Design a protein around this ligand. Structure first.
Ligand code: LYS
Ligand code: LYS
Ligand code: LYS
Ligand code: THR
Ligand code: THR
Ligand code: THR
Ligand code: THR
Lengths: 159, 392, 387, 160
């Protein structure tokens, strides 16, 4: 069977991304980040952490939250920077998010490939990626939203 | 009236005895005062055997002949269930193909009191969406349910519900009474293979309630109904935990953070038909201006995935390609984690307190997924389940 | 150049054999022929499906039964199509008019036809479900094929069973009628109905193996059109699958045979070789013998015994160790002495002849099943069918 | 699956039947009958022999041959009658043959039943039967032939 459906394209620019850089890859370290945000009653959406490097056993943790809570989140975390031996906490309140929404996309790697190819062809740089069987999300410059959305609509024939 | 469409999977129709039992169940549903539409999968493991024959006779089987082959498999079940139903006094009417079966022809037949058996219906879409692959029996069942505005679409198999976790791994795991469409899609995206994803997506698009239940018992199973958006914030909850150890983790180290580079990786993978998932890329370094891209694929595909990406390492400019086939995936799904702070914190704390290291994190609006050592999966699942007090 | 090729279950038991057959199909196309293909369900599928049918519904309805068997056939047809397409032929599957196939043939496509009610004439009466054999010859008829090839693991029609008669020989050729008679009293290489269809439309049939390149046996031409001087004896056939039942003392008046055969038909006893000779002037009574499959023998006796006790006849006998031997040949129509030689042959191996039945080109007898080998061998060498 | 055709109905009044009564049911006895007929170069068609009786160990053998040869055939056999064997030889030159022709009729016993029922309903008596998968034949009075054919044509919807 290997059946899939592509249902649409979503854009958003209501969020900031904060990145904790150089957090040590051992049990309990992510907890410190998210408990701190939690105690400040900050509600977050995206969390991305890729694998830690062999060279120094650290990684980065990025999360998204409403733009109005960004600075406050990034300020709650700074009181953990030295304890956790982090390199820095980056901040960015100009990030846009474009997704392709669907279902069953694992069995069609062409979709993911074509997603990336569409954005290449309209000269949009993909900064972050988070995908699943039902959503291919990337974070980009908010100014590239329109072009990205449009490039995706054409490529996959949604709209 | 009361219109019920029922889909029965291979496990439900694995023998003559089971087909007669199912037939009586179909007729009982009629007798309870419902109009009944039935969709049958091929018997037992027929589909897997046919797919194996197909690949052995043609390495790249044409879509047309494959549809013919698979439809034949289903027609066998349809004929048998039709015979069993007629022996029990019902009047069977059999339909085929997407419009043959127009919903109107089915409605007409249902109005004459006939139990309708249907195969191959992807909708009468004269819904701007793009469709991929061949529509299976799950999808035709929900499509029929959408087209005819059925009150429910029942999916029968040997699985008697959707649970809060694998009851084999977590003793306190229990059958869910209900959950939303979006909650079901998220579970099914990260472990639960109780329903075809596309069929569930269809269900939420046309707001058709689904019931996952067993053809071996009279348990009413789990209801899948309502949008997650329409749940009141105060009564939105965490619904379950799911695990998976069927996958490998590939990581491309040191990709240049400029346009077209992601495409070079995934085009290469797509042309090799490697079924990638959980793609993950965080921000580049700014010193070096490079980043890493990690993804998962079935373990059987890992070697091929690595062969392809290693060739591109030499040619292209990546630093390395890593391979890992002892990785596990544990996830928490729930509408309750939208708009509620501290869910992510409690998730991480839970794993911390059983000394489990979180290697990779990914999310949806209502889902947390992490990759860990596969040997840590059971402990992770229990810990998360216990922390969030799922299923009592 | 139009060839219809039908492939049986044995020919399509596995992926490897399906691919082998596909190359065989393509080779036939390459040799300058338009090609139409018909496939049975993959070896044994049909029997398995019939057994599921009976289990889910005693007396399966015809509509769903056809639906069921057609699905089985469609599996093979999809697979064979795939295999042909992989060897570079353009395939076209049909689920279906002669014209539509012709259109496709003219575009160079190899046509795979699963099945169509196939009638020769508007008046003939048709019974049962059309199978693969008859859709193959029907297609061959409608498209006017040069030959309709019937492929299996059987590589020809023989003058006797070679494992029993060491001098058995593959026939080069025989007529429809001669093939009809052999198949009437012996194993069926093809379905009888389908051969009769062939006869009606004069479609030459070729029985051949899908495992070798032996050209097989041709079944063509009517027996009427063979001149008497050419007419030969074709072969010997044996059978030990039947019981024989005799109703003794049925009164020779209208309607009595009906009582016997209505009772049997309602119980679905597949009776055959019904035989009744003249009644005795004294008693006004005669006997009726028939054969049925041994599995049906019990029920046949139970049924007829009820009727005996109602007083319709004297006795009912049961015999399930009986065999039948037959000689078939256009050559026996107009030549006296064939019957004499037949009886002499069995006399000389001291085989007693229990019952005798006949068509104009066939002699059949019933004997003890243990005498079959001897009888077949004696007849085969008496008429010199290959030595 | 278990398919059959009923193609037509055929009649004939070209034959006589000769019946040799009370032949011993032992090897070589049928040979004596048909060798005699062979030496006179009489071509025969139908041969009918049912099972011998338990009491006597004898059967009858009936055959048909062209109607002009029937009398000569009966006399040739009469020469060997009781001459170390049989009880009587009969001759009948008013015998008709009607047949339902087709293929695959074994798996439909209703056809044989309906054949007999058709002849019953037009009050035709069936004197001999000889059938196969491809032909249901019976011998009756030649006068009954037209009624028989008609009845069979109607029963099986062939029409002639
Ligand atoms: N909003 C929840 C869960 C976030 C992870 C899923 N998007 C929290 O802030 O803890
Ligand atoms: N949806 C698939 C599989 C159903 C579940 C397994 N029997 C089909 O076409 O039958
Ligand atoms: N006409 C041949 C064969 C008769 C038996 C078949 N009808 C003969 O007189 O011996
Ligand atoms: C990096 C962070 O996820 C760490 N591995 C933890 O378990 O807390
Ligand atoms: C690193 C990769 O995502 C790159 N920025 C691209 O868009 O192709
Ligand atoms: C009666 C006659 O057929 C005898 N049984 C024989 O074999 O000659
Ligand atoms: C004996 C049987 O053939 C009877 N003469 C009938 O016509 O029914």
């Amino acid at each position: 069977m290997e059946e899939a459906v592509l249902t649409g394209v979503a854009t958003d620019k209501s969020e900031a991304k904060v990145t904790v850089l150089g957090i040590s890859d051992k049990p309990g370290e992510a907890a410190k980040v998210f408990r701190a945000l939690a105690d400040a009653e900050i509600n977050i959406d995206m969390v991305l952490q890729n694998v830690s490097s062999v060279e120094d056993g650290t990684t980065d943790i990025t999360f998204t939250c409403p733009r109005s809570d960004g600075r406050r989140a990034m300020e709650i975390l700074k009181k953990l920077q030295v304890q956790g031996n982090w390199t820095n906490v980056l901040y960015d309140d100009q990030v846009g998010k474009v997704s392709l929404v669907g279902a069953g996309m694992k069995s069609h790697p062409g979709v993911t490939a074509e997603f990336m190819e569409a954005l290449r062809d309209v000269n949009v740089n993909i900064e972050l990626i988070s995908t699943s069987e039902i959503r291919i999300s990337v974070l980009i410059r908010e100014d590239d939203l329109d072009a990205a959305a449009r490039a995706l609509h054409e490529q996959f024939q949604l709209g | 009236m009361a219109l019920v469409v029922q889909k029965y999977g291979g496990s439900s129709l694995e023998s003559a005895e089971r087909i007669r039992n199912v037939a009586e169940r179909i007729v009982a549903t009629k007798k309870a005062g419902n109009d009944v539409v039935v969709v049958c999968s091929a018997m037992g493991d027929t589909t897997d055997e046919l797919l194996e024959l197909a690949a052995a006779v043609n390495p790249v089987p044409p879509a047309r002949e494959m549809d013919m082959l698979l439809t034949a498999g289903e027609r066998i079940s349809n004929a048998l269930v039709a015979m069993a139903i007629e022996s029990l006094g019902a009047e069977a009417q059999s339909f085929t193909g997407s419009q043959d079966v127009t919903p109107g022809r089915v409605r007409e037949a249902l109005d004459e009191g006939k139990i309708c058996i249907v195969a191959g219906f992807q909708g009468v879409n004269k819904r701007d969406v793009t469709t991929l692959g061949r529509g299976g029996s799950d999808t035709t069942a929900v499509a029929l349910a959408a087209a005819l505005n059925a009150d429910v679409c029942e999916i029968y198999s040997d699985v008697d519900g959707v649970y809060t976790a694998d009851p084999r791994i977590v003793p306190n795991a229990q059958k869910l009474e209900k959950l939303s469409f979006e909650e079901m899609l998220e579970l099914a995206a990260v472990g639960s293979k109780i329903l075809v994803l596309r069929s569930v997506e269809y269900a939420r698009a046309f707001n058709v309630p689904l019931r996952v239940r067993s053809s071996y018992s009279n348990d009413p199973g789990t209801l899948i109904a309502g949008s997650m958006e329409d749940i009141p914030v105060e009564e939105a909850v965490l619904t379950g935990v799911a695990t998976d150890k069927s996958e490998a983790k590939v990581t491309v180290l040191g990709i240049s953070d400029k346009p077209g580079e992601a495409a070079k990786v995934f085009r290469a993978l797509a042309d090799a038909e490697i079924n990638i998932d959980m793609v993950l890329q965080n921000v580049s370094s700014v010193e070096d201006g490079t980043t890493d891209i990690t993804f998962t694929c079935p373990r059987s595909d890992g070697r091929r995935a690595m062969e392809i990406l290693k060739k591109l390492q030499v040619q292209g400019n990546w630093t390395n390609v890593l391979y890992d086939d002892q990785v596990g995936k544990v996830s928490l799904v729930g509408a309750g984690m939208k708009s509620h702070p501290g869910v992510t914190a409690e998730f991480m704390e839970a794993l911390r307190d059983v000394n489990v290291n979180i290697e990779l994190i990914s999310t949806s609006e209502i889902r947390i997924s992490v990759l860990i050592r596969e040997d840590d999966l059971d402990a992770a699942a229990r810990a998360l389940h216990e922390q969030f007090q799922l299923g009592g």
